[PDB]
Amino acid sequence: AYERGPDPSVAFLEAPTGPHSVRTSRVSGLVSGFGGGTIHYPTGTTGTMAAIVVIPGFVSAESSIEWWGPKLASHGFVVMTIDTNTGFDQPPSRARQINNALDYLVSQNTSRTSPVNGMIDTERLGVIGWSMGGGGTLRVASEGRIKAAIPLAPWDTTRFRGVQAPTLIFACESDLIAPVRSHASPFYNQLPDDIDKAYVEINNGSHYCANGGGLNNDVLSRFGVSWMKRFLDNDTRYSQFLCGPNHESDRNISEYRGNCPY
Structure with missing residues (x-):
């Protein structure tokens, strides 16, 4: 359907882009509820597609996670990479700003001036986030709106026994900032049994290993594109x-950890 x-194929996933060229539109920093950002969307498509918000970590700008924007948009998603209100915002604040960003992106489907008017299936939303932004992702994934979550080298102080969206955690083995033994690995083990999930x-990997645009793009592509395909688009061609x-x-x-099949 979607x-x-x-x-x-593996080669298809691992290529620098997906099939589509990508246009971009700016969201002003004066937007209410978050710090602005970029909407990335494919050319050469018809109909509606899932939407994704991507959020960075502590004292980090949108550019830290921008790779994910064209990478996923080029595969038939509308993807908004964002800034937070300040670099110092902590995970609870970041979760709130993910929600505000999702609300904003959904509103674009019907905004008269928006280049993505009529292009978003607003029932089909995902979130990706790095470090504290990854904590924020896990928080929003506990609320029951979003349909897929990818925390990248997540950092948080809470526990995630209420996550209720299919969740893929990318961990970075050698992370000194959000060490896997204290963050990513506990977070995965805390995830409940009634979701589809994976730990990669x-x-x-340094703390920056899953941000995109490094030497790990083959794994991030194969898992991250397939996750959003499988769970936002219900696209079982990607199960493999x-x-x-x-x-x-x-x-x-x-x-690797997981509870295949999905």
């Missing part, structure tokens, strides 16, 4: 990249 784009730990391969046998994946 399937878009070519039948996938990138081998020798998530459930089936022995993920740890990939030299760039140091640990």
Whole structure:
């Protein structure tokens, strides 16, 4: 119903972009409820598609996570990468600003002046976030609106036993800022049993290993594009990249956990 784009392959996922070229539109920093950002959207499509908000971490700008914007937009999503109100905002604040950003992006589907008018299926929303933004992602994933969540090297102080959207945590093995033993790994173990979930730990990864645009793009592409396809688009052509391969046998994946099949 919601399937878009070519039948996938590993090479297709791992290429620098998906099938579509990407246009961008600015959201002013004066927007209420968050710090502005960029809406990324594909050319050469018809009909509606899922929407995604991407949020950075402490003392970090939108550019820290921008890779995810064209990467996913080029695969048939409308993706808004954002700034927070201040660099110092903590995870509870970031969760609130994800919600405000989602509300804003949904409002664009019907705004007269918006380049993505009529292009968003507002029932189909995902969130991606790095570090504290990843804590914020896990918080919003506990609320029952969003349909997919990808925390990237998450940092938070709470626990996540109420997450209720399918959740893929990217962990960075060598992370000194949000060490996996205190953040990503506990967060995954806290996730309840009634969701589809996955833990992908990138081998020798710094805190920045899952932001995108580094040497780990093959794993981030295969897992992250497939996650949003599978869970936002209900697109089971992508199941094969998530459930089936022995993920740890990939030299760039140091640990994998999950509850396949989905």
